[PDB]
Design a protein around this ligand. Structure first.
Ligand SMILES: CCC(=O)SCCNC(=O)CCNC(=O)[C@H](O)C(C)(C)COP(=O)(O)OP(=O)(O)OC[C@H]1O[C@@H](n2cnc3c(N)ncnc32)[C@H](O)[C@@H]1OP(=O)(O)O
Ligand SMILES: [Cl-]
Ligand SMILES: [Cl-]
Ligand SMILES: [Cl-]
Ligand SMILES: [Cl-]
Ligand SMILES: [Mg+2]
Ligand SMILES: [Mg+2]
Ligand SMILES: [Mg+2]
Ligand SMILES: [Mg+2]
Ligand SMILES: [Mg+2]
Ligand SMILES: [Mg+2]
Lengths: 265, 264, 314, 316, 265, 309
């Protein structure tokens, strides 16, 4: 089109704070946090038996709580589960206009996003919803990274893409520990001395390139070690250096760390 | 894999009898016909205001009537409508195991079929349905025929593909109001005399090639003029010659005509 | 996208009148013709040594003549020629904003259109042109028909696509006579009796499908026999039936013929409106299907009737 | 690349005469025929128990017989059979330089041709063969026509592509009779009258488009009715009209019929020369517009004249 | 498919032990080794004049020796050589059912594997072979890594995919020394201090992603320095961390090292 | 094709020396340098108001100066600018046969190169230019790296491909300092200590793979810190290791540094010739593999040693 890359969404995304839908007592705290994006979770932080109740809890929270200027997103279950369709139907039929975004996990190709888009669009039209939802996806599988560009171009709704390093590692068969960060066995040996390198380099850089090509925000995923502030800082700094615009917080203390690294200047 | 093309489903598909879901009085008449496949319709034979009730009737018929050995299909609404998702959700959640198949209309690419497959599969798993549904699709748009092969390879559930000449003509901007058959203004002029040619040749042939490549049944669609048996025979014969295995009946009289042409 | 297929340009395109840019004495009459689109030619109707002058003539006509409500287009030389870049540079630098469109010949892939788009866009920006040109292309080669869909989706500027039967046949190695129309040696023999069929069926239909998929106007090309009005009517009727919206006029006589065919007859229109009324009545009765003159009509029939109507309301 | 479409091989291909490799007595007659291309068959005209012997026969025929100016091709068995690899290996290891080409049947995708190319290339290198083989392929399946362009672009060796109407119809599940030609049940009905149309239109046109896009010769396949001479002519004329350059002969009578349709008449050649001479004379006087008897000539009208003259000189 | 990614072959592949077919006196030591996979070589460890004899040796070895529970593979010559067809023809026509697998070198596209598949399938059918051969391929060229996913999906026979660092480096025009491992000239300079990084990161990660997407086993290739046990461990650990399941042994004492790193807990 | 990968152009490309077309007083110094390739710039080193003059300057320099055996290239403006078409038209219509190459910046897809190829080919035919121009491109955007293989295969004119790390970083939204090199915030933390890693790894390797697949020269782009020779050396050495054959010089002093790194050392070539000799001896006694200094060495090492020599 003889201008370069499309501009990404202008909204801040320095930090996405996650909380399980099964704990409504956390919602007001999340709303009061310094996080730019709130992720209410129906997926991995919620046991299968609790998913139906968590779904109801989230719908009530969306309709009943003051979320301020925060971007409100919900991580639904995967398309390889029986839960995902009910997540989408109930959310789009019952949740009010305050809902901003849906997060789709384990995306492995463009058609996965198209599928959710097909369903979401129909319900929006059926219910006469005035504010169209945006999409964000998680790259957390071999298929996801292998198909990262087609996924980035898969929907006009798409605004963000996250790397889920833990589930990515599991999918890739990576012999890693914890969630993200330095890996003990990934180092170069030179004259008896060890130098640790970045085992996530390609996955992060490819995600960034795919996102920037198609006007999407690339985002860094969870970091597991809550007691390692400097580990988080290093991980976030690497991601920012590679072009990512923010990082998940799965613990309240991580929000300040993410804001420290990702706030522009 | 260095073998011949995939084998198509072995089930009979000589004729598919259509009937609006808003006319439940037709259902037992359809069930008693000589049609191999029964298509209960929620789409273009049903007014928008009646689609919700038509859906309720179809579910009742699936759980209520004796369909014998018929292949029981339901044509849902298109993905560009607000009706399609409720069609699928209600059917898979409420209809018993007698439902065999759903027909997806106005398919423009493989992702459309993938989208329905995503939804259907999740509900089957959630409800523990023992008999997985098959799919059939209609090629009835410009995009459809342009992407016919990718559509033919779009799902393991896919068993059949029909050419819908009515919507196809509209989408293509074809100057006509008739449904299939001979076109008055499509002829060759040689030394004063006119010779009428087949305006549907490529569409049908492309569909057959796509279907045979991927082990799918290619089917001819609706013939509008139910007062013209010889017109129907001509259309059905052309389709058979091109490799299609059957044809829709949109009226009881057409069922006998279809079986005449397509019975091996 | 989950929407209707992209709507084509609403502008009329029933007839495209061609005229060599080397003959400016005809320009005035073309402007006063009944053609919806005017095509001033720099390509095959102009000898190589006459191209430079024809280029200057066309630019002068774009700036000087009153073209009324005509859609003004120029056919440039192909990307396989040394002429094309000078055609585009001179037109975009020297011609005023009355120029609407350029026609690109012998298009074989999406990249050909993109190449012209790249040049045109840079010059429009450099000169600050206020009305961006639209593109139309000619499918007149084997490569063209084989890659027809990618060509249809090659540029936001693209508004129309023509089948050039004479050059298509040459490229395909077709043993044909004249330009388009019935071919003597293309017939079916049944019981010693011959039945002529359409040797252009796939090319036309595939172009229509590609165009309609991407919101482009499919157009029929030149018909060579100027003395055969009924032959022209036959060719135009086949095109209109397959979905094409208009046809070239390479002779002033053909303009009236094109407009007659590609404007829906009064009989066809009245039938379309009755079907709409019949379907509208069935809706109020709570039915999506009913009977019209002994044949089935339904919701899909509404959209077919709407095809006939909007072309007549043009 | 900003030039005209790739030029096809500059050799005549009006008729390809087939003969089973199990019948070596026919070989000298084929070599003496008026066919441009000779196809010795290892495939469907040869029974499974005769395939090994036919392979030996063909190899001897290539090494021992005088084939004159004929383009010598061998149709091997398909990649879905246990025979194909043995066909290629024995041919490329044992046959002399006189072998020009191999024909690959039932090609469904580009990778089928690539597979054969990989094998053929390695044996040519191992044996030090001096004249590399060209390929030709048969489109005779649904997969083949669906993937026709990718097949056309599948190999630098590829020179020709045929439509096998009978096997194509069987693959497509077409309810047809015989091999090619008019089909009884494929007609248009108007006012009680029937008009028969072409049930092979797209298959033929698409093959021609794919071939001409990639510099390949598009060829029409077998016609079954050996007594229907006018049926053959009609089929050949349709093919010629759609852009095919030749047709198979599976019976010696068909050779004359094929050459008749695909050779320009002496009248057409003469008129073509005159038009080109008129143009040349005009340019000699520095004129851009040519005039022949009647009026003015379109550039496409001289384009075909040059094609016709080029044809006549290819047949010497 | 709305299911998890395809499961890889279940068989062990911690170590692949290579040996030139031109040295049949070493075959019994290989059969007795602790390697899961045995690779009898007809390619780059056999001089051109010795290839015909090595072929006969291997065929005799397949029919003659006790291979126990070893997965028995043969690396044939590449499709750019005149040797490959004779390698495959003789193996499939003359070797018994003890042969498990063929290793295809220098694969640059999916069509390369299809070509070998076409030939193997024909002979298996002609000879009525009871146990169909599996395939493994080596990614050891620029074309290979560029087309790694299409190669991973190239055949139902494909079970494993190896990175060949020696040929890869040559094909890529890498100014490297030795085979794999730390590269002296690949380091980051920070405040007059050198930090060596992984010059093989993308190639290894991309291979793992392609393999896991399509149910293939990703394998690390040869490590040249025999005398460097710690260097081997470092290379093996990096590979394991990135998701590879095993590594070649081109010297007998590398088998134990590979098993130490790749044996699952 | 069943052959080895296509061979790249054989011409030297150890260093590409850039100079703005707006400063013709520096041209003669460039022609006197030890740089293999000369890049006269119409793009980012030239302000918009100077572009037309620089165009005229460059044309005069091409027709007027002695460039010896240098490969003479001109970096035109991008396809997203109004300047590019006039750069091409003027150069191809007015510059003499001494011009060798045009460098296209910000290439995002194959069609970009095709667009320039279409224009260049037509003018060459119109003017009857006897020496067809080659192309080189810069991968300096997200789209460029995502589509890097299709770009590398986009034209028979294409001979070289550069990574432009600064503009790449900007497009990618990378939080980096300077141009290329070590990045302060890109490090691994292990028990309290930091280990810096390569934030350009995939970009460089992917460019090399795309290039080598299609017979193109992969080249490393600008390095910003002119006072940091060791910094330059580390960057050049990483690139050479990954397979890049040369590096830009944007300051005159960088030419020697590029030549030093991208001319294989006598130590490296002696070790290569030593390996080749060892494998001749191995092959002579019926061995496809042998031992070299406690290391494995076989037929694969031959092509490796040949890359060196
Ligand atoms: C072209 C685009 C498309 O989408 S077409 C695909 C979907 N279309 C349809 O489903 C249309 C099906 N057709 C119909 O709705 C009806 O046949 C139409 C055309 C409306 C005519 O209905 P009607 O006037 O009742 O027919 P008729 O009087 O001639 O009835 C004769 C006897 O047969 C029955 N009948 C009628 N239609 C069906 C049917 N589809 N299936 C089974 N039976 C049918 C009628 O009851 C009547 O029977 P009886 O003798 O009273 O027992
Ligand atoms: Cl994760
Ligand atoms: Cl034309
Ligand atoms: Cl046949
Ligand atoms: Cl830069
Ligand atoms: Mg997860
Ligand atoms: Mg319809
Ligand atoms: Mg033309
Ligand atoms: Mg056959
Ligand atoms: Mg190797
Ligand atoms: Mg730049």
């Amino acid at each position: 089109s003889f201008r370069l890359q499309p501009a990404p969404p202008a909204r801040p995304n320095r930090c996405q704070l996650f909380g399980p839908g099964s704990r409504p007592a956390l919602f007001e705290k999340m709303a009061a946090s310094a996080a730019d994006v709130i992720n209410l979770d129906l997926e991995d932080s919620v046991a299968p038996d609790d998913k139906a109740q968590a779904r109801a809890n989230i719908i009530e929270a969306i309709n009943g709580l003051d979320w301020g200027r925060k971007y409100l997103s919900v991580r639904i279950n995967g398309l390889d589960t029986p839960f995902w369709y009910r997540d989408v139907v109930d959310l789009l039929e019952q949740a009010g206009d305050r809902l901003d975004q849906i997060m789709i996990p384990k995306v492995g190709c463009a058609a996965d996003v198209y599928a959710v888009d097909a369903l979401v669009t129909a319900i929006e039209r059926a219910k006469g919803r005035t504010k169209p939802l945006s999409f964000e996806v998680i790259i957390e599988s071999a298929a996801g990274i292998a198909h990262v560009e087609e996924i980035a171009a898969s929907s006009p709704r798409l605004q963000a893409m996250s790397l889920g390093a833990a589930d990515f590692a599991a999918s890739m068969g990576m012999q890693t520990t914890g969630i993200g960060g330095t890996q003990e066995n990934y180092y170069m040996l030179h004259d008896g001395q060890k130098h640790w390198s970045d085992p996530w380099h390609w996955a992060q850089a490819a995600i960034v390139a795919a996102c920037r090509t198609h006007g999407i925000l690339p985002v860094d995923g969870p970091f597991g070690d809550f007691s390692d502030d400097e580990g988080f800082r290093a991980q976030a700094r690497r991601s920012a250096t590679l072009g990512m615009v923010g990082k998940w917080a799965i613990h309240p203390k991580q929000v300040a760390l993410a804001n420290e690294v990702f706030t522009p200047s």
